Structures are given as structure tokens and as C-alpha cells.
Amino acid sequence: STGNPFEGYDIYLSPYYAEEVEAAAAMIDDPVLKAKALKVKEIPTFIWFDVVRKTPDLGRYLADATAIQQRTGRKQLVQIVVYDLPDRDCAAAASNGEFSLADGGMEKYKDYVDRLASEIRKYPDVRIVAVIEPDSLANMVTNMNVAKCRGAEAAYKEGVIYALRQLSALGVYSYVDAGHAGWLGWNANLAPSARLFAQIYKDAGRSAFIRGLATNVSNYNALSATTRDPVTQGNDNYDELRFINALAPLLRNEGWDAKFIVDQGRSGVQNIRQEWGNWCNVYGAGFGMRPTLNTPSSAIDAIVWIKPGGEADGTSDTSAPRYDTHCGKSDSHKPAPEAGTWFQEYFVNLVKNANPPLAA
Ligand SMILES: O=[N+]([O-])c1ccc(O[C@@H]2O[C@H](CO)[C@@H](O[C@@H]3O[C@H](CO)[C@@H](O[C@@H]4O[C@H](CO)[C@@H](O)[C@H](O)[C@H]4O)[C@H](O)[C@H]3O)[C@H](O)[C@H]2O)cc1
Ligand SMILES: [Mg+2]
Ligand SMILES: [Mg+2]
């Protein structure tokens, strides 16, 4: 289709996240904060498939969404994240991941995608929006000095193209991850990013199902900054809107008229980072701008909550195999559990600090 893929759809509410929120609310003693916590389970989030053992769960969500659709007659849209490349998260320790290129990682990744595809095939009547491999391509632009990233370059591109070709053949709408304003928004990185995204789009066959890009995944940038965050100094693109408005024309000239979705899940509190490159469980974050199709620009299909607030970005335990020093910074919330696991203290702050505030 030509238009906004989200238009006219009810957004399927993650049962995984609802259950986490339900249990989290139960542990909050403040009745006001408890009631606000419970509102969060009604806010649409993206469902991450960060491990291949989760692929059968996609079938379960799509069956559930299909049943809701058939019961109510209201079209359902399921939001998912493809996040399992071999040598994943190559500039960091926190979200390492289960596949290694040293151990048949590439083939195992294709199989992971194939399993995702086999579930989608069983439930063709539900629309799916997928974010493709957060951080992957952003690392390819910026971190070829990092041995793991340099070694992963061919596999990242191959893997992302495979996923895109396989999902596009199933009518899945993809948004390829594109870092954020403080990553690829820098003039050092814009043009090279535009070139890379255009290349992936091309090699993936230029399917109309490849709708565009996703920004600010698991990050904290403002969409449109009322006051400039001191941490953004030197970068003219100091919010996601500016980043996108600088990127979109470049990418267009490079052969792709791309549309955008923006994570605002943990963007409610600005001015909370000592450095812009600090990403791990940043202290005092709040739930941000709610998912909506009323965006400030025609390039932007939707504001979304891609990273589900409350799930950790990485362990702060200096003894743990996945310990990354970003997770030990003075402006990280500590002690933090393993990436992807529930982080109660952190969730409690997101609710309390939410902007706009959550209602009862
Ligand atoms: O003015 N100049 O002249 C000039 C010259 C060169 C410049 O270089 C740029 O400097 C930037 C910092 O300003 C760097 O941005 C940081 O890069 C990190 C990766 O190394 C990212 O971390 C990821 O974050 C993800 C969540 O978003 C995590 O999920 C993931 O695990 C984690 O790895 C940070 O967000 C991101 O902010 C750029 O790479 C770098 O190219 C900049 C300016
Ligand atoms: Mg500058
Ligand atoms: Mg992460």
C-alpha cells in the first residue's frame, strides 16, 4: 500500500508487557502510582523477538490478534522487533545475544527468520509492523574500529537483507533501525548513513513493504525539544525531528523516499544524561509522548513505544559476563538486572516521572 500502514488499525496490546505491568503494579504500595502503573498496560508497545526460543510465541500473539479481530470485526495490527543478528550489539557487552559467527551464526540467523516467517504464514489476516535489527546498521556506519563490528559487517547486511526479503514477501511492513539524533544525526555520519540505508533498500528489492526507518529505539531523545538538552551541544540535529528532517531529503536523493517511526517510550524526561552516548538504564527517565499517528511531520508515520519501559538495558553487576561499563556510569540506575529482564525500581520511576503524566 501507499499510505500510513498504521491508519485505521487497532494496535494489539502485548500480553507479555501487560503481565509485567500487572505484577509491577502489584508491588507498588502508593495507590496513586499503582493506578497510574496499570494505565501503562493499555499503551501499545513493540514485542521483541530477541531469542529464537520466542519464535513460537509470535504464533500465539498472532492467533490471539486473529481471534480478537474475528470476534470484534476490528482489524488488528501486531508490532514486533527482529533482534537476533549473529554477534549482536557489537559495540557493547550488555545485549550480546545467542548467535556467534564463530559458531554457525549466519545460518542459525536465517533459520530464526524462517521460524518467524512460518508463524506469520499461519496467520495471514493480521497486519504486522516490524522494526528490523536495532543498532545493527548504525554500528556499521560508526564503529568499524571495533573488532566485533568489523568482523560482523557482511553478516549484518546479509542478515538484514534476508529478513527484509522474507518479511516483505509475507506483506509485513518493515522499518529498518536507523540509530538516533545523537548517533547518526552528526554531520560526520549523515551522508554515510543515507548511503547505507539506500543500499539495503536496493538489495532488499525496494519492496513497498519496506516502509522506511525507525529512530530512537531504546533511547531517550526528545521528538521536538522545547528546550535544547545541554548534552546535545555541537549537533545541529538535537532532537529526533531535526535528525529526520536532515536525513529524509538526503535519503530521497539517494533513491529512497522513506517514512519514519519514532520511539518515545522513555523520552518523558530530558536533560538526564552526562554524555549523549550514555544509553544504559539512564537514571530518572520517564514514560514519554504516547503512541499516536498525529505526528509533527509528513515523513513520520507514527510515534511509538518500541523499547518497553521497565525492561533493563543491561546488568550493572561488574562480575557478570554481559557487564558493559555504560551500565555502571554515574547517571545509570543501579543495581540493574540483565538486559530484557524486569527492572522494578526503574519502571516505578518511569511512571512517577511520566510526561505527559499518566492518569489513574
Ligand atoms: O563533531 N564531530 O566532529 C564528531 C565526530 C565524530 C563523532 O562520532 C560519533 O559520536 C557519537 C557520540 O556523540 C556516537 O554516538 C553514540 O554511539 C554509540 C555506539 O558506539 C551508541 O551506543 C549504542 O546505543 C544504543 C541505544 O541507542 C544501544 O542499544 C547500544 O548497545 C549502544 O552501543 C550511542 O547511543 C550513540 O549516541 C557515534 O557512534 C559516533 O560516530 C561525533 C561528532
Ligand atoms: Mg555540529
Ligand atoms: Mg537494548
mmCIF file of C-alpha atoms and ligand atoms in Angstrom:
data_model
loop_
_atom_site.group_PDB
_atom_site.id
_atom_site.type_symbol
_atom_site.label_atom_id
_atom_site.label_comp_id
_atom_site.label_asym_id
_atom_site.label_seq_id
_atom_site.Cartn_x
_atom_site.Cartn_y
_atom_site.Cartn_z
ATOM 1 C CA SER A 1 0.000 0.000 0.000
ATOM 2 C CA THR A 2 0.947 3.667 -0.434
ATOM 3 C CA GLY A 3 -0.257 5.294 2.811
ATOM 4 C CA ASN A 4 0.380 5.137 6.554
ATOM 5 C CA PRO A 5 0.317 1.391 7.452
ATOM 6 C CA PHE A 6 -0.997 2.143 10.993
ATOM 7 C CA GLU A 7 -4.086 4.038 9.740
ATOM 8 C CA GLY A 8 -7.449 2.522 10.711
ATOM 9 C CA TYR A 9 -5.959 -0.286 12.794
ATOM 10 C CA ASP A 10 -6.354 -1.145 16.454
ATOM 11 C CA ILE A 11 -2.940 -1.773 17.908
ATOM 12 C CA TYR A 12 -2.581 -5.159 19.543
ATOM 13 C CA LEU A 13 -1.629 -4.838 23.205
ATOM 14 C CA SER A 14 1.307 -7.025 24.200
ATOM 15 C CA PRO A 15 0.182 -9.676 26.731
ATOM 16 C CA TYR A 16 3.853 -10.156 27.684
ATOM 17 C CA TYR A 17 4.138 -6.486 28.689
ATOM 18 C CA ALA A 18 0.658 -6.433 30.266
ATOM 19 C CA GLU A 19 1.670 -9.294 32.608
ATOM 20 C CA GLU A 20 4.928 -7.494 33.560
ATOM 21 C CA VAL A 21 2.975 -4.275 34.278
ATOM 22 C CA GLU A 22 0.292 -6.164 36.243
ATOM 23 C CA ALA A 23 2.926 -7.762 38.522
ATOM 24 C CA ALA A 24 4.813 -4.436 38.732
ATOM 25 C CA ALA A 25 1.662 -2.570 39.779
ATOM 26 C CA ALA A 26 1.028 -5.227 42.448
ATOM 27 C CA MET A 27 4.401 -4.383 44.080
ATOM 28 C CA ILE A 28 3.822 -0.602 44.139
ATOM 29 C CA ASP A 29 2.436 0.434 47.547
ATOM 30 C CA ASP A 30 1.429 4.018 46.609
ATOM 31 C CA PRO A 31 -2.210 3.689 45.458
ATOM 32 C CA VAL A 32 -1.858 6.701 43.155
ATOM 33 C CA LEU A 33 1.281 5.305 41.471
ATOM 34 C CA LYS A 34 -0.309 1.843 41.438
ATOM 35 C CA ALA A 35 -3.296 3.164 39.443
ATOM 36 C CA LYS A 36 -1.009 5.052 37.054
ATOM 37 C CA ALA A 37 1.118 1.916 36.592
ATOM 38 C CA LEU A 38 -1.977 -0.022 35.460
ATOM 39 C CA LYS A 39 -2.753 2.550 32.712
ATOM 40 C CA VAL A 40 0.572 1.569 31.078
ATOM 41 C CA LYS A 41 -0.703 -1.892 30.056
ATOM 42 C CA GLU A 42 -3.225 -0.118 27.778
ATOM 43 C CA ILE A 43 -0.410 1.680 25.932
ATOM 44 C CA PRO A 44 0.781 -0.141 22.784
ATOM 45 C CA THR A 45 4.378 -1.389 22.786
ATOM 46 C CA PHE A 46 6.508 -3.430 20.350
ATOM 47 C CA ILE A 47 7.106 -7.157 21.007
ATOM 48 C CA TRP A 48 10.775 -8.132 20.804
ATOM 49 C CA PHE A 49 11.955 -11.431 19.411
ATOM 50 C CA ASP A 50 15.438 -11.257 20.912
ATOM 51 C CA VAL A 51 15.802 -15.071 21.210
ATOM 52 C CA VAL A 52 14.805 -17.836 18.784
ATOM 53 C CA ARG A 53 13.047 -19.724 21.594
ATOM 54 C CA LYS A 54 10.492 -16.843 21.384
ATOM 55 C CA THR A 55 9.501 -17.555 17.750
ATOM 56 C CA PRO A 56 6.629 -19.931 18.706
ATOM 57 C CA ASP A 57 5.223 -17.075 20.843
ATOM 58 C CA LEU A 58 4.716 -14.998 17.713
ATOM 59 C CA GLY A 59 2.268 -17.674 16.540
ATOM 60 C CA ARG A 60 0.454 -17.321 19.875
ATOM 61 C CA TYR A 61 0.236 -13.477 19.620
ATOM 62 C CA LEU A 62 -0.970 -13.631 16.007
ATOM 63 C CA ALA A 63 -3.566 -16.293 16.871
ATOM 64 C CA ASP A 64 -4.707 -14.063 19.745
ATOM 65 C CA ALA A 65 -4.831 -10.986 17.493
ATOM 66 C CA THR A 66 -6.657 -13.005 14.823
ATOM 67 C CA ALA A 67 -9.268 -14.125 17.415
ATOM 68 C CA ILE A 68 -9.784 -10.526 18.637
ATOM 69 C CA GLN A 69 -10.158 -9.429 15.006
ATOM 70 C CA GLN A 70 -12.667 -12.205 14.247
ATOM 71 C CA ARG A 71 -14.631 -11.615 17.481
ATOM 72 C CA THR A 72 -14.864 -7.811 17.147
ATOM 73 C CA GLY A 73 -14.556 -7.299 13.367
ATOM 74 C CA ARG A 74 -11.929 -4.654 14.129
ATOM 75 C CA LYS A 75 -8.675 -5.020 12.154
ATOM 76 C CA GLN A 76 -5.630 -5.718 14.377
ATOM 77 C CA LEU A 77 -2.002 -4.642 13.917
ATOM 78 C CA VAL A 78 0.819 -6.501 15.743
ATOM 79 C CA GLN A 79 4.099 -4.675 16.462
ATOM 80 C CA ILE A 80 7.281 -6.760 16.574
ATOM 81 C CA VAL A 81 11.065 -6.330 16.721
ATOM 82 C CA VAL A 82 13.529 -8.519 14.809
ATOM 83 C CA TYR A 83 16.609 -8.543 17.040
ATOM 84 C CA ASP A 84 18.918 -11.549 16.859
ATOM 85 C CA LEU A 85 21.752 -10.990 14.350
ATOM 86 C CA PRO A 86 24.903 -13.066 14.881
ATOM 87 C CA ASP A 87 27.458 -11.126 17.001
ATOM 88 C CA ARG A 88 24.603 -8.802 18.013
ATOM 89 C CA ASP A 89 25.209 -5.453 19.762
ATOM 90 C CA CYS A 90 28.792 -5.461 18.546
ATOM 91 C CA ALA A 91 29.945 -2.214 20.205
ATOM 92 C CA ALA A 92 28.596 -3.305 23.595
ATOM 93 C CA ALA A 93 28.546 -6.155 26.118
ATOM 94 C CA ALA A 94 25.047 -5.634 27.562
ATOM 95 C CA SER A 95 22.894 -7.263 24.847
ATOM 96 C CA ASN A 96 25.392 -9.788 23.392
ATOM 97 C CA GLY A 97 22.965 -12.441 22.084
ATOM 98 C CA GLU A 98 22.861 -16.145 21.372
ATOM 99 C CA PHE A 99 24.323 -16.495 17.877
ATOM 100 C CA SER A 100 28.062 -16.288 17.132
ATOM 101 C CA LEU A 101 29.646 -16.020 13.705
ATOM 102 C CA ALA A 102 32.372 -18.218 15.167
ATOM 103 C CA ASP A 103 29.700 -20.914 15.634
ATOM 104 C CA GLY A 104 27.466 -21.071 12.526
ATOM 105 C CA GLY A 105 25.734 -17.799 13.496
ATOM 106 C CA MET A 106 24.726 -16.792 9.976
ATOM 107 C CA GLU A 107 22.758 -19.952 9.130
ATOM 108 C CA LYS A 108 21.191 -20.010 12.611
ATOM 109 C CA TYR A 109 20.040 -16.424 11.979
ATOM 110 C CA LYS A 110 18.354 -17.354 8.663
ATOM 111 C CA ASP A 111 16.611 -20.203 10.484
ATOM 112 C CA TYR A 112 15.450 -17.743 13.189
ATOM 113 C CA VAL A 113 13.950 -15.570 10.427
ATOM 114 C CA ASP A 114 12.443 -18.692 8.802
ATOM 115 C CA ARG A 115 10.753 -19.598 12.092
ATOM 116 C CA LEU A 116 9.356 -16.039 12.356
ATOM 117 C CA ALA A 117 8.099 -16.452 8.767
ATOM 118 C CA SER A 118 6.497 -19.852 9.474
ATOM 119 C CA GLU A 119 4.395 -18.295 12.242
ATOM 120 C CA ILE A 120 3.326 -15.307 10.129
ATOM 121 C CA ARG A 121 2.279 -17.726 7.343
ATOM 122 C CA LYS A 122 -0.230 -19.406 9.669
ATOM 123 C CA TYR A 123 -1.972 -16.101 10.441
ATOM 124 C CA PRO A 124 -2.152 -14.002 7.247
ATOM 125 C CA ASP A 125 -5.198 -11.931 8.256
ATOM 126 C CA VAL A 126 -3.431 -9.643 10.724
ATOM 127 C CA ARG A 127 -1.223 -6.656 9.789
ATOM 128 C CA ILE A 128 2.338 -6.696 11.157
ATOM 129 C CA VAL A 129 4.790 -3.840 11.600
ATOM 130 C CA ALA A 130 8.364 -4.946 12.252
ATOM 131 C CA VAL A 131 11.378 -2.958 13.382
ATOM 132 C CA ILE A 132 14.459 -4.565 11.840
ATOM 133 C CA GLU A 133 17.549 -5.112 13.992
ATOM 134 C CA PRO A 134 18.125 -2.103 16.287
ATOM 135 C CA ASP A 135 21.712 -0.773 16.367
ATOM 136 C CA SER A 136 22.952 -3.052 13.584
ATOM 137 C CA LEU A 137 23.366 -0.595 10.668
ATOM 138 C CA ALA A 138 24.200 2.339 12.987
ATOM 139 C CA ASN A 139 27.248 0.350 14.204
ATOM 140 C CA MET A 140 28.208 -0.345 10.595
ATOM 141 C CA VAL A 141 28.440 3.417 9.959
ATOM 142 C CA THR A 142 30.216 4.405 13.146
ATOM 143 C CA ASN A 143 32.106 1.516 14.767
ATOM 144 C CA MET A 144 34.245 -0.361 12.213
ATOM 145 C CA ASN A 145 37.135 0.339 14.634
ATOM 146 C CA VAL A 146 35.506 -2.235 16.938
ATOM 147 C CA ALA A 147 36.782 -5.731 16.099
ATOM 148 C CA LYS A 148 33.429 -7.487 16.687
ATOM 149 C CA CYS A 149 31.642 -4.918 14.454
ATOM 150 C CA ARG A 150 34.260 -5.099 11.696
ATOM 151 C CA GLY A 151 34.008 -8.919 11.684
ATOM 152 C CA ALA A 152 30.200 -8.707 11.654
ATOM 153 C CA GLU A 153 29.821 -6.319 8.704
ATOM 154 C CA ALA A 154 28.950 -8.827 5.935
ATOM 155 C CA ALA A 155 26.676 -10.843 8.227
ATOM 156 C CA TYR A 156 24.733 -7.765 9.445
ATOM 157 C CA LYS A 157 23.986 -6.665 5.864
ATOM 158 C CA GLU A 158 23.248 -10.198 4.657
ATOM 159 C CA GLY A 159 21.026 -10.809 7.717
ATOM 160 C CA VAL A 160 19.042 -7.569 7.456
ATOM 161 C CA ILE A 161 18.502 -8.103 3.691
ATOM 162 C CA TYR A 162 17.304 -11.694 4.286
ATOM 163 C CA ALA A 163 14.860 -10.583 6.991
ATOM 164 C CA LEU A 164 13.528 -7.795 4.758
ATOM 165 C CA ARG A 165 13.097 -10.063 1.718
ATOM 166 C CA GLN A 166 11.384 -12.736 3.797
ATOM 167 C CA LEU A 167 9.049 -10.345 5.667
ATOM 168 C CA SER A 168 8.212 -8.274 2.555
ATOM 169 C CA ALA A 169 7.152 -11.468 0.731
ATOM 170 C CA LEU A 170 4.710 -12.017 3.609
ATOM 171 C CA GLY A 171 3.234 -8.490 3.450
ATOM 172 C CA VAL A 172 4.897 -7.360 6.678
ATOM 173 C CA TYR A 173 5.611 -3.643 6.947
ATOM 174 C CA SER A 174 9.253 -3.043 7.890
ATOM 175 C CA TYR A 175 11.031 -0.075 9.396
ATOM 176 C CA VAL A 176 14.800 -0.571 9.411
ATOM 177 C CA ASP A 177 16.550 0.669 12.528
ATOM 178 C CA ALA A 178 18.375 3.917 11.950
ATOM 179 C CA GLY A 179 20.021 4.853 15.296
ATOM 180 C CA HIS A 180 19.045 8.276 16.704
ATOM 181 C CA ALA A 181 19.857 12.001 16.517
ATOM 182 C CA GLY A 182 22.907 11.657 18.812
ATOM 183 C CA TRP A 183 24.255 8.687 16.839
ATOM 184 C CA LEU A 184 23.679 9.187 13.101
ATOM 185 C CA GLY A 185 22.475 12.823 13.329
ATOM 186 C CA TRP A 186 26.046 14.137 13.454
ATOM 187 C CA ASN A 187 27.310 15.569 10.149
ATOM 188 C CA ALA A 188 30.154 13.036 10.332
ATOM 189 C CA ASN A 189 27.514 10.271 9.962
ATOM 190 C CA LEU A 190 24.502 11.574 7.995
ATOM 191 C CA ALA A 191 25.641 11.106 4.382
ATOM 192 C CA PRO A 192 27.250 7.702 5.055
ATOM 193 C CA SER A 193 24.037 6.580 6.802
ATOM 194 C CA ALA A 194 21.854 7.761 3.908
ATOM 195 C CA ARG A 195 24.071 5.770 1.511
ATOM 196 C CA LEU A 196 23.892 2.605 3.603
ATOM 197 C CA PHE A 197 20.104 2.707 4.055
ATOM 198 C CA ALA A 198 19.643 3.255 0.317
ATOM 199 C CA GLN A 199 21.895 0.215 -0.408
ATOM 200 C CA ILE A 200 19.971 -2.081 1.974
ATOM 201 C CA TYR A 201 16.653 -0.898 0.464
ATOM 202 C CA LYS A 202 18.043 -1.651 -3.021
ATOM 203 C CA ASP A 203 19.498 -5.097 -2.191
ATOM 204 C CA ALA A 204 16.248 -5.949 -0.379
ATOM 205 C CA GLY A 205 14.394 -5.413 -3.675
ATOM 206 C CA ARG A 206 12.850 -1.975 -2.945
ATOM 207 C CA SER A 207 9.592 -3.535 -1.686
ATOM 208 C CA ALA A 208 6.816 -1.064 -0.837
ATOM 209 C CA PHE A 209 6.510 -3.112 2.382
ATOM 210 C CA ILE A 210 9.898 -1.659 3.376
ATOM 211 C CA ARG A 211 8.179 1.485 4.568
ATOM 212 C CA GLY A 212 11.212 3.258 5.997
ATOM 213 C CA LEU A 213 13.197 3.680 9.185
ATOM 214 C CA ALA A 214 12.903 3.610 12.965
ATOM 215 C CA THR A 215 14.700 6.068 15.249
ATOM 216 C CA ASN A 216 15.427 6.436 18.971
ATOM 217 C CA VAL A 217 14.908 2.724 19.705
ATOM 218 C CA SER A 218 15.748 2.126 23.409
ATOM 219 C CA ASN A 219 16.920 5.711 23.661
ATOM 220 C CA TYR A 220 15.700 8.895 25.320
ATOM 221 C CA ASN A 221 15.855 11.781 22.814
ATOM 222 C CA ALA A 222 13.079 14.341 22.506
ATOM 223 C CA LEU A 223 10.956 14.221 19.377
ATOM 224 C CA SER A 224 10.914 18.019 19.231
ATOM 225 C CA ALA A 225 12.857 19.674 22.023
ATOM 226 C CA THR A 226 11.108 22.592 23.721
ATOM 227 C CA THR A 227 14.437 23.426 25.433
ATOM 228 C CA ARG A 228 17.719 22.171 23.978
ATOM 229 C CA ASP A 229 19.332 19.419 26.098
ATOM 230 C CA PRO A 230 22.882 20.638 27.069
ATOM 231 C CA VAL A 231 24.196 17.169 26.219
ATOM 232 C CA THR A 232 23.400 17.682 22.505
ATOM 233 C CA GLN A 233 25.827 20.596 22.020
ATOM 234 C CA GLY A 234 27.658 20.667 18.688
ATOM 235 C CA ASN A 235 24.953 18.658 16.930
ATOM 236 C CA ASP A 236 22.506 20.816 14.962
ATOM 237 C CA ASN A 237 20.127 17.832 14.968
ATOM 238 C CA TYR A 238 19.496 17.879 18.693
ATOM 239 C CA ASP A 239 16.114 16.119 18.576
ATOM 240 C CA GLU A 240 14.612 13.269 16.509
ATOM 241 C CA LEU A 241 12.525 15.615 14.312
ATOM 242 C CA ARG A 242 15.620 17.596 13.244
ATOM 243 C CA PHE A 243 17.548 14.388 12.635
ATOM 244 C CA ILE A 244 14.733 13.049 10.437
ATOM 245 C CA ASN A 245 14.317 16.376 8.568
ATOM 246 C CA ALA A 246 18.075 16.385 7.829
ATOM 247 C CA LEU A 247 18.094 12.668 6.865
ATOM 248 C CA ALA A 248 14.879 12.366 4.770
ATOM 249 C CA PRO A 249 15.974 14.674 1.866
ATOM 250 C CA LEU A 250 19.431 13.064 1.686
ATOM 251 C CA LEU A 251 17.953 9.596 1.560
ATOM 252 C CA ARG A 252 15.445 10.759 -1.087
ATOM 253 C CA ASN A 253 18.296 11.976 -3.329
ATOM 254 C CA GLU A 254 19.980 8.594 -2.661
ATOM 255 C CA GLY A 255 16.905 6.862 -4.125
ATOM 256 C CA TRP A 256 14.585 6.113 -1.210
ATOM 257 C CA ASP A 257 11.532 8.138 -0.200
ATOM 258 C CA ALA A 258 11.458 6.690 3.323
ATOM 259 C CA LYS A 259 8.896 7.168 6.074
ATOM 260 C CA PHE A 260 9.714 7.108 9.803
ATOM 261 C CA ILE A 261 8.537 5.839 13.211
ATOM 262 C CA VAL A 262 9.971 7.289 16.466
ATOM 263 C CA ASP A 263 10.370 5.634 19.852
ATOM 264 C CA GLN A 264 9.270 7.985 22.647
ATOM 265 C CA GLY A 265 8.776 5.292 25.324
ATOM 266 C CA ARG A 266 11.414 6.637 27.719
ATOM 267 C CA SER A 267 11.556 10.239 26.489
ATOM 268 C CA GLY A 268 9.399 12.000 29.096
ATOM 269 C CA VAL A 269 12.371 13.429 30.997
ATOM 270 C CA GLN A 270 15.054 15.391 29.155
ATOM 271 C CA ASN A 271 18.430 16.679 30.499
ATOM 272 C CA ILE A 272 19.231 13.427 32.435
ATOM 273 C CA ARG A 273 22.492 12.355 30.744
ATOM 274 C CA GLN A 274 26.075 13.429 31.484
ATOM 275 C CA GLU A 275 27.003 12.396 27.922
ATOM 276 C CA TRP A 276 24.732 11.826 24.928
ATOM 277 C CA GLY A 277 26.337 8.397 24.298
ATOM 278 C CA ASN A 278 25.097 7.141 27.715
ATOM 279 C CA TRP A 279 22.253 4.708 26.983
ATOM 280 C CA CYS A 280 22.115 2.117 29.731
ATOM 281 C CA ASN A 281 19.274 2.376 32.243
ATOM 282 C CA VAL A 282 19.665 6.157 32.358
ATOM 283 C CA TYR A 283 18.540 7.367 35.780
ATOM 284 C CA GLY A 284 15.270 9.227 36.285
ATOM 285 C CA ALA A 285 13.789 8.577 32.843
ATOM 286 C CA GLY A 286 10.037 8.862 32.459
ATOM 287 C CA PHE A 287 7.445 7.474 30.084
ATOM 288 C CA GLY A 288 7.193 9.960 27.204
ATOM 289 C CA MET A 289 4.840 11.055 24.424
ATOM 290 C CA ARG A 290 2.129 8.417 23.855
ATOM 291 C CA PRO A 291 1.893 6.354 20.657
ATOM 292 C CA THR A 292 -0.013 8.352 18.067
ATOM 293 C CA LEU A 293 -0.468 8.988 14.357
ATOM 294 C CA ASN A 294 -0.722 12.781 14.970
ATOM 295 C CA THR A 295 2.918 13.466 14.167
ATOM 296 C CA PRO A 296 4.682 16.804 13.593
ATOM 297 C CA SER A 297 5.721 15.812 10.058
ATOM 298 C CA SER A 298 4.509 14.009 6.974
ATOM 299 C CA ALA A 299 7.740 11.972 6.934
ATOM 300 C CA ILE A 300 6.693 10.433 10.283
ATOM 301 C CA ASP A 301 4.065 7.665 10.160
ATOM 302 C CA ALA A 302 3.805 7.232 13.950
ATOM 303 C CA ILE A 303 5.174 7.936 17.366
ATOM 304 C CA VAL A 304 5.583 4.550 19.059
ATOM 305 C CA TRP A 305 6.903 2.811 22.166
ATOM 306 C CA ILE A 306 9.397 0.317 20.733
ATOM 307 C CA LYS A 307 11.586 -0.421 23.749
ATOM 308 C CA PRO A 308 9.178 -1.494 26.513
ATOM 309 C CA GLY A 309 9.944 0.732 29.514
ATOM 310 C CA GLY A 310 10.744 -1.310 32.630
ATOM 311 C CA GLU A 311 12.830 -3.997 30.876
ATOM 312 C CA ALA A 312 16.523 -3.421 31.627
ATOM 313 C CA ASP A 313 19.149 -2.313 29.067
ATOM 314 C CA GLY A 314 21.946 -4.265 30.764
ATOM 315 C CA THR A 315 23.337 -5.548 34.059
ATOM 316 C CA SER A 316 25.283 -3.177 36.348
ATOM 317 C CA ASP A 317 26.925 -6.174 38.018
ATOM 318 C CA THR A 318 30.647 -5.767 37.289
ATOM 319 C CA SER A 319 31.077 -9.562 37.826
ATOM 320 C CA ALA A 320 28.549 -10.587 35.128
ATOM 321 C CA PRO A 321 29.701 -11.787 31.661
ATOM 322 C CA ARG A 322 27.494 -9.149 29.942
ATOM 323 C CA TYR A 323 28.641 -6.215 32.072
ATOM 324 C CA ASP A 324 29.180 -3.107 29.978
ATOM 325 C CA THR A 325 30.776 -0.038 31.585
ATOM 326 C CA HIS A 326 27.992 2.223 30.239
ATOM 327 C CA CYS A 327 25.709 0.407 32.681
ATOM 328 C CA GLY A 328 27.989 1.419 35.568
ATOM 329 C CA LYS A 329 28.022 5.172 34.775
ATOM 330 C CA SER A 330 27.119 7.713 37.485
ATOM 331 C CA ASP A 331 23.879 8.517 35.598
ATOM 332 C CA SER A 332 22.717 4.885 35.216
ATOM 333 C CA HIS A 333 20.121 3.399 37.567
ATOM 334 C CA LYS A 334 21.898 0.737 39.672
ATOM 335 C CA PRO A 335 21.743 -2.058 40.618
ATOM 336 C CA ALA A 336 20.271 -3.158 37.278
ATOM 337 C CA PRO A 337 19.454 -6.730 36.184
ATOM 338 C CA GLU A 338 20.216 -8.445 32.834
ATOM 339 C CA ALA A 339 19.123 -6.780 29.568
ATOM 340 C CA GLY A 340 15.494 -7.619 28.738
ATOM 341 C CA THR A 341 14.512 -8.633 32.273
ATOM 342 C CA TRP A 342 12.169 -6.696 34.584
ATOM 343 C CA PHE A 343 13.662 -3.721 36.451
ATOM 344 C CA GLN A 344 11.097 -2.691 39.094
ATOM 345 C CA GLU A 345 12.786 0.438 40.556
ATOM 346 C CA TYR A 346 13.267 1.716 37.016
ATOM 347 C CA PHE A 347 9.662 1.121 35.998
ATOM 348 C CA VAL A 348 8.421 2.851 39.155
ATOM 349 C CA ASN A 349 10.427 5.958 38.125
ATOM 350 C CA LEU A 350 9.101 5.859 34.542
ATOM 351 C CA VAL A 351 5.518 6.007 35.879
ATOM 352 C CA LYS A 352 6.212 8.682 38.512
ATOM 353 C CA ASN A 353 8.243 10.746 36.054
ATOM 354 C CA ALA A 354 5.918 10.279 33.051
ATOM 355 C CA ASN A 355 5.464 13.314 30.808
ATOM 356 C CA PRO A 356 2.699 13.774 29.902
ATOM 357 C CA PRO A 357 1.620 12.379 33.294
ATOM 358 C CA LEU A 358 -0.313 9.109 33.407
ATOM 359 C CA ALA A 359 -3.915 9.356 34.641
ATOM 360 C CA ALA A 360 -5.293 6.994 37.332
HETATM 361 O O1 LIG B 1 31.580 16.643 15.934
HETATM 362 N N1 LIG B 1 32.249 15.794 15.364
HETATM 363 O O2 LIG B 1 33.170 16.153 14.642
HETATM 364 C C1 LIG B 1 32.007 14.428 15.595
HETATM 365 C C2 LIG B 1 32.834 13.439 15.049
HETATM 366 C C3 LIG B 1 32.576 12.095 15.320
HETATM 367 C C4 LIG B 1 31.502 11.747 16.142
HETATM 368 O O3 LIG B 1 31.266 10.426 16.412
HETATM 369 C C5 LIG B 1 30.040 9.941 16.952
HETATM 370 O O4 LIG B 1 29.954 10.203 18.353
HETATM 371 C C6 LIG B 1 28.663 9.888 18.884
HETATM 372 C C7 LIG B 1 28.560 10.426 20.313
HETATM 373 O O5 LIG B 1 28.344 11.849 20.241
HETATM 374 C C8 LIG B 1 28.452 8.373 18.774
HETATM 375 O O6 LIG B 1 27.110 8.040 19.139
HETATM 376 C C9 LIG B 1 26.938 7.004 20.106
HETATM 377 O O7 LIG B 1 27.431 5.752 19.614
HETATM 378 C C10 LIG B 1 27.186 4.619 20.456
HETATM 379 C C11 LIG B 1 27.742 3.380 19.765
HETATM 380 O O8 LIG B 1 29.166 3.463 19.826
HETATM 381 C C12 LIG B 1 25.701 4.444 20.761
HETATM 382 O O9 LIG B 1 25.538 3.404 21.727
HETATM 383 C C13 LIG B 1 24.542 2.435 21.423
HETATM 384 O O10 LIG B 1 23.287 2.929 21.920
HETATM 385 C C14 LIG B 1 22.170 2.055 21.704
HETATM 386 C C15 LIG B 1 20.866 2.741 22.153
HETATM 387 O O11 LIG B 1 20.674 3.955 21.404
HETATM 388 C C16 LIG B 1 22.440 0.769 22.490
HETATM 389 O O12 LIG B 1 21.313 -0.106 22.394
HETATM 390 C C17 LIG B 1 23.749 0.110 22.009
HETATM 391 O O13 LIG B 1 24.096 -1.024 22.810
HETATM 392 C C18 LIG B 1 24.904 1.104 22.103
HETATM 393 O O14 LIG B 1 26.089 0.508 21.547
HETATM 394 C C19 LIG B 1 25.140 5.756 21.321
HETATM 395 O O15 LIG B 1 23.729 5.629 21.510
HETATM 396 C C20 LIG B 1 25.435 6.904 20.368
HETATM 397 O O16 LIG B 1 24.968 8.133 20.936
HETATM 398 C C21 LIG B 1 28.676 7.899 17.329
HETATM 399 O O17 LIG B 1 28.685 6.469 17.323
HETATM 400 C C22 LIG B 1 29.978 8.438 16.732
HETATM 401 O O18 LIG B 1 30.046 8.195 15.327
HETATM 402 C C23 LIG B 1 30.683 12.734 16.683
HETATM 403 C C24 LIG B 1 30.937 14.066 16.412
HETATM 404 MG MG MG B 2 27.872 20.385 14.538
HETATM 405 MG MG MG B 3 18.962 -2.738 24.399
#
